[PDB]
Structure formats: structure tokens, C-alpha cells
Amino acid sequence: DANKIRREEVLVSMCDQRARMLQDQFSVSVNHVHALAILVSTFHYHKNPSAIDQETFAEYTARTAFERPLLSGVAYAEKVVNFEREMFERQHNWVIKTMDRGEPSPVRDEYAPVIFSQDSVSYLESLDMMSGEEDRENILRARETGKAVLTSPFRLLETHHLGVVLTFPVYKSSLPENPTVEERIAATAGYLGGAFDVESLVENLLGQLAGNQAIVVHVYDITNASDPLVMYGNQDESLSHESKLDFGDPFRKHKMICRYHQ
Amino acid sequence: DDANKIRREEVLVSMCDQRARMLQDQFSVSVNHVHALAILVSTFHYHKNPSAIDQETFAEYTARTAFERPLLSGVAYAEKVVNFEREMFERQHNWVIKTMDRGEPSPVRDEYAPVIFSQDSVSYLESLDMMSGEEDRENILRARETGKAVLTSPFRLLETHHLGVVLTFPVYKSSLPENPTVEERIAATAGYLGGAFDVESLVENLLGQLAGNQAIVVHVYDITNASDPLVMYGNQDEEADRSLSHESKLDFGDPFRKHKMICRYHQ
Ligand SMILES: c1coc(CNc2ncnc3nc[nH]c23)c1
Ligand SMILES: c1coc(CNc2ncnc3nc[nH]c23)c1
């Protein structure tokens, strides 16, 4: 009887600690990605001529990789509307490519080609981030809301690891104060994004912890309560505990669930 | 009764430990973002040809990112200038290196650390030799010799006279060897990225928003020297409960310094 009580208390403690650790690391990453969005705005748009380039972005992001613990890499995609495509591709000496096959993009109203990338995600360069549905939806919500947004869990490029993408908007100085959504769209310069590689880096975070073999941990995206999506853990459908997670995007909801094996 | 007294201590422990965690975490976040600024100056001012950082750019970026550094009133970048170079440096900048105590032209020194970039919140630092204050000077030396973020003892900051501490990071030239000796670090020093932890104002602001703040008295001490504890935050001597206290752990990240928090009831 006393033993059941102690067992419950240990589960709550273990689960709550893991949830705090994960929320905190996510939070630190989001904050540092916000700083990068501000850096691109200040150095690429506010300065004339631009005082940021791929070499500099690669260096800075490499040297600050420690500031973004759950992220496999960061990249900056620029907003390009179709009338500007020819000039853009001539300036960059490359063609805007599709994410799925790396083929030259068919005509679209607009694109979000990656122009700067951390070398860890170098394969993103020139890819149109609107040619992937999760990234596209993220890009639109980022620019319309003015804030960091997260995707549902999905399998990331190259590694195929299950993760979530974080996108921040970057705006031109023409953005009015207290802007409408329409004003936000018009003033959009691009999108600073990062991949939370949950499958690998959350596993590295949690798997090293004492007691890991005694409990089963899942993280769910419960944005749609009738359709919970696994973000971390196995696909399995008594004694559990739900620990709170808040990853900072009001559009999404998450939770951690822990159980004992036996 | 004896039940209520046990619970009274339990609440003090919880309140004090939570406040200590908050202080430690917020300082850690600030230190990490100062580290990123040091890397920014290295990458964008030194490595990039030409430099992308002038005073206007530094002021803008630091203002827009001030939320990243919650326990800091301002940040600035001081460049290492040896005396051989002083006249050249002053001619290029069209200003003279000044002392921090009176803003007067600096006397001849072997070297200087004049502020060349500043967040507007600490704009009065521009052109001041940060080696002309003892706390800042010792911090600069330990920063460059160790390669890590360092903290001063508590002292009254320039202009505000608020009781605080200074955080200083070294910035090195690309000539810094792998696995450098201290002598190599000194030779490769470019300058120093510093930030003012205005403990008196900003820790009061942090604590005063918390529920139960009126019930508790919070002090923070620098206990680097056991026999000479130094007040970092708090009063005396205040109307405080002498019968019960709690000590909460604090670690601000510099192994050269030690700190602790003590809470008591107002009662
Ligand atoms: C700009 C907008 O969104 C991004 C990051 N998206 C992203 N990064 C890394 N791997 C990915 N795989 C799919 N989408 C990915 C950069
Ligand atoms: C470079 C080296 O150290 C600094 C920060 N020092 C500092 N900042 C703001 N107020 C001060 N008052 C004394 N020292 C101060 C900048």
C-alpha cells in the first residue's frame, strides 16, 4: 500500500523532470532562433548594402550551434514572388528547386528558396520551402501572426527523422506598427527556420537519464484531441502520468505521458 | 501549533528555492546571449572584410535583442589598445580614450580597453577605458587569461550607482592557437564584451512581481571569501524574522566566485 504510493510519487517526479528539461531546452532554442531572425533583419535588410552573406551566416550559426540544443540546423529562406524569379536566379546563379526531387520549380505565385544555411543543413540551399506542405503552412502562419510557429510532427529531409519545424518571420522595415495581417504579408522578407530533430536529439536528451529503462515516455501533439500524433516514442495505443508541455505556439498543444514497463 | 510551524518552514524553503532557481536561470540565459554577442563581434566585425558592425548597427541589434538578456542593463564592446597604438587609435576614431572616474583624457598606461560599441542604455561608456576601474580591470584580465565568462564582486555601477556585478567575455583574434596557453591568449586578445548585471534594480523588479514578496526578505551574498561575505542584493538589518531562515544555493557560473541566497520572513 505504502509501496504503491511511493511508486506513483517516483513516476510523477521522473515524468515531470523530463517534461521540464524538454520544455526548457525547446524554449532556449526558440529564443536563440528569434535572435537569428533579428540578426537577418538587421544585417540583410536594415543595412544597405546587405552586410550578411552565406559565408558569414554559416560561420555565425556554426559557432552558436550550442545555443540551439534541440535543433539539427537553421536556414533562412527569402520570399520571392514570381515576377522577381528570373532576376533572383540570375543574382544567385542557381535555380529554385523543389524539395521532393530537387528539380527546377514549376511556376508558382511565390517561393521561399533557402539562401543562407548552416552547413549541417546545407542540402536546403536553393530549395523552395513552400514546396513541402508542413513547411508551407508554417511559413504562412509565421508571416500572418508575426510569431514563432511549429509544425505537426513529420519526417525531415535527408535524415527522415521524425521532428517538428520551427519558423520565424522576417519583415522589411516598411512593416507598419500594429500591422494587420495584410500588412504583415506585404512587408514579409523571408523566414528563419530550424528543425527540431526529436527522433535523435530528444532521444539523446532522455535516453541518457537514470531510470530510463524503468519507464515508457511518449510526447504527443494533441492539437486535435481526437487525433493525437506521436512526436516522441513508440506507436502503442494502467498507471500513467501526464506531464505538461508548452512549446510556445498557441496553435499547437502537446503533452508528455510516462508509464512503468510492468 | 507544531504543525503550523513545520508548514511555515516548508513554505519558506519552497519560496526561497524557487526565487534562487529563477535568479540562477535568468542569469544563465543572459550569460549565454552575451556569449553569442562576443561571437557576433568576432564574426561580423573582425572576420568579415569589411566590418559589418559600426556603433549604429551594434546599438540596433542589442536594443532589439535586449529581451534575451534579462538581468543586464546594457552591453558594450571594448577593444584592446596597447600604448604603442594609442595615438593611431585616437586619430582613426577622432576621440581620445578617457578615464571612467571623471571622463578625462587617460594618462599614459601600458594598455587600455576603450569602449567602441555600446547599447544605448549604456551609451556613457563610449570611449571610456574599462581598465581604469579596478573591478572591470580585474575582470578583463581574468576573462582573457581563462577564455571564459567572468564576474566581478558586487560594486556600484557607473552613472546609476546601482549595486551590481559586471560580466566580461574575451574576444580573440583568429591567430589564437588551438589549445592555447595563457600567454597565447593574452597575445591573441582582441577585446572584451561586457554586460552590467544591475542587481539592485533588476533583481528587485524580478522579485517584486512574485506573489508573497511582501512576506519574505531576500538577500544574496557573494561568499567568495568565507570570512568577508559581500552583499550583492538586499538590505540589513531590515525588519526580518531572526528565529528562522533558509539558505538556497546559487551558481552564477564563474568558478572564481561563490554566492548564496538567504530568505527570512518579514515577521
Ligand atoms: C526555412 C523555413 O523552414 C526551414 C526549416 N525547414 C526544415 N529544416 C530542416 N529540415 C527540414 N526537412 C523538412 N523541412 C525542413 C527553413
Ligand atoms: C567592457 C568590459 O566591461 C564592460 C561592462 N562594464 C560596465 N558596464 C556598465 N556599467 C558599468 N559600470 C562599471 N563598469 C560597467 C564592457
PDB file of C-alpha atoms in Angstrom, chain A residues 24 28 30-39 41-43 46-47 50-53 56-57 59-60 63-64 66-67, chain B residues 25 29 31-40 42-44 47-48 51-54 57 60-61 64-65 67-68 172:
ATOM      1  CA  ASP A  24      13.326  24.335 -21.165  1.00  0.00           C
ATOM      2  CA  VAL A  28      16.163  28.181 -25.174  1.00  0.00           C
ATOM      3  CA  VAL A  30      13.226  29.134 -29.818  1.00  0.00           C
ATOM      4  CA  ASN A  31      14.708  32.209 -28.135  1.00  0.00           C
ATOM      5  CA  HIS A  32      18.034  31.838 -29.985  1.00  0.00           C
ATOM      6  CA  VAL A  33      16.274  31.314 -33.308  1.00  0.00           C
ATOM      7  CA  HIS A  34      14.378  34.576 -32.597  1.00  0.00           C
ATOM      8  CA  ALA A  35      17.723  36.306 -32.185  1.00  0.00           C
ATOM      9  CA  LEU A  36      18.833  34.926 -35.574  1.00  0.00           C
ATOM     10  CA  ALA A  37      15.692  36.283 -37.208  1.00  0.00           C
ATOM     11  CA  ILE A  38      16.523  39.702 -35.722  1.00  0.00           C
ATOM     12  CA  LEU A  39      20.147  39.313 -36.984  1.00  0.00           C
ATOM     13  CA  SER A  41      16.603  41.652 -40.368  1.00  0.00           C
ATOM     14  CA  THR A  42      19.291  44.000 -39.035  1.00  0.00           C
ATOM     15  CA  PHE A  43      22.177  42.855 -41.242  1.00  0.00           C
ATOM     16  CA  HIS A  46      18.253  47.392 -42.448  1.00  0.00           C
ATOM     17  CA  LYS A  47      21.822  47.767 -43.616  1.00  0.00           C
ATOM     18  CA  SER A  50      23.440  43.901 -47.107  1.00  0.00           C
ATOM     19  CA  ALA A  51      26.126  43.051 -44.601  1.00  0.00           C
ATOM     20  CA  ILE A  52      25.325  39.342 -44.310  1.00  0.00           C
ATOM     21  CA  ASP A  53      26.099  36.541 -46.755  1.00  0.00           C
ATOM     22  CA  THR A  56      29.049  34.796 -42.596  1.00  0.00           C
ATOM     23  CA  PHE A  57      25.723  33.125 -41.788  1.00  0.00           C
ATOM     24  CA  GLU A  59      30.175  30.809 -39.610  1.00  0.00           C
ATOM     25  CA  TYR A  60      27.920  32.527 -37.088  1.00  0.00           C
ATOM     26  CA  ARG A  63      29.846  28.935 -33.763  1.00  0.00           C
ATOM     27  CA  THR A  64      26.498  29.404 -31.947  1.00  0.00           C
ATOM     28  CA  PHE A  66      25.469  25.296 -28.759  1.00  0.00           C
ATOM     29  CA  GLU A  67      22.778  27.964 -28.190  1.00  0.00           C
TER      30      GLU A  67
ATOM     31  CA  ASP B  25      18.292  30.548 -14.634  1.00  0.00           C
ATOM     32  CA  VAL B  29      20.217  32.842 -20.116  1.00  0.00           C
ATOM     33  CA  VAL B  31      25.396  34.900 -19.946  1.00  0.00           C
ATOM     34  CA  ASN B  32      24.630  32.669 -22.942  1.00  0.00           C
ATOM     35  CA  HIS B  33      23.313  35.549 -25.014  1.00  0.00           C
ATOM     36  CA  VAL B  34      26.340  37.674 -24.103  1.00  0.00           C
ATOM     37  CA  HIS B  35      28.485  34.801 -25.358  1.00  0.00           C
ATOM     38  CA  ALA B  36      26.596  34.939 -28.659  1.00  0.00           C
ATOM     39  CA  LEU B  37      27.310  38.703 -28.886  1.00  0.00           C
ATOM     40  CA  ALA B  38      31.019  38.043 -28.432  1.00  0.00           C
ATOM     41  CA  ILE B  39      30.814  35.557 -31.341  1.00  0.00           C
ATOM     42  CA  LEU B  40      28.829  38.210 -33.317  1.00  0.00           C
ATOM     43  CA  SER B  42      34.248  38.190 -33.848  1.00  0.00           C
ATOM     44  CA  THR B  43      32.370  37.030 -36.986  1.00  0.00           C
ATOM     45  CA  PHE B  44      30.878  40.315 -38.207  1.00  0.00           C
ATOM     46  CA  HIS B  47      36.396  38.199 -39.656  1.00  0.00           C
ATOM     47  CA  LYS B  48      34.239  39.973 -42.205  1.00  0.00           C
ATOM     48  CA  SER B  51      33.360  45.039 -40.876  1.00  0.00           C
ATOM     49  CA  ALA B  52      29.571  44.965 -40.767  1.00  0.00           C
ATOM     50  CA  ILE B  53      29.465  46.467 -37.274  1.00  0.00           C
ATOM     51  CA  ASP B  54      29.509  50.184 -36.586  1.00  0.00           C
ATOM     52  CA  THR B  57      24.465  48.563 -36.009  1.00  0.00           C
ATOM     53  CA  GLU B  60      20.243  48.426 -33.069  1.00  0.00           C
ATOM     54  CA  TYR B  61      20.953  44.737 -32.715  1.00  0.00           C
ATOM     55  CA  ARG B  64      16.200  44.578 -30.487  1.00  0.00           C
ATOM     56  CA  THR B  65      17.655  41.637 -28.516  1.00  0.00           C
ATOM     57  CA  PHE B  67      14.833  40.699 -24.090  1.00  0.00           C
ATOM     58  CA  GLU B  68      17.424  37.921 -24.499  1.00  0.00           C
ATOM     59  CA  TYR B 172      40.123  36.724 -29.604  1.00  0.00           C
TER      60      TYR B 172
END
